[PDB]
Amino acid sequence: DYINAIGRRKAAVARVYLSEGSGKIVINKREIEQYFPSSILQYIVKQPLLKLDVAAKYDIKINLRGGGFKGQSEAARLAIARALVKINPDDKPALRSEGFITRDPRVVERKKPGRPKARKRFQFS
Template identity: 50%
Template sequence: MPELVQYYGTGRRKSSVARVFLRPGSGDFKVNGRAFEQYFVTAAQRTMAKQPLVSSETAANFNVVANVSGGGVNGQAGALKLGIARALMEFNIELRKKLKAEGMVTRDSRGKERKKYGQKGARKRFQYSKR
């Protein structure tokens, strides 16, 4: 039985986590068992998620199977982007230079700012009454 060749990468963004498997194939893309176009409906989300494959010119060479959880759809697209980039680097470490130059290797560490006591939110204050 031939061994299954696949490359794995994990991506995180805000509270989203993406587990990505790249398998040699024809460019089929599944996210949580659904077609890529069904899962990410806006063009911006699709562009962001596919960016590593497009910039490394490997979009037609791999089938992508991804499992994303947590957060919102934009955070999930960002997590998927990092996961794909890491899986591509596992496939060929020479792609790292190109991906790094386009900022796809660095994890975006920005998260939700905590709510402070004595305030309505992280920055928003309670309404001030002069008298």
């Protein structure tokens, strides 16, 4: 069968379809090691499976859109955590202990008029 989930982080959106299998994580019709050629990014994406010892037990298909690499990896991690919670509701405390299921609401602040940036001000003198 299929388990559907969605994660969000900044401008990145991840839609994750999870199914029974062994190890195939396919992102945008690409392998995980080819889409994310960074050990840190791969670890971020595959964090909840390693925490719940559910690795080597599923196939995941991910559709990511928007943002950069870190935002996309965090969104994918959130989506995988939500899918795991949907599959088994008893792992919610374990995932909460690490915070994989909390939606981080931090976004880029709007630039304000009369200022070079959101908070940085001009040199008064």
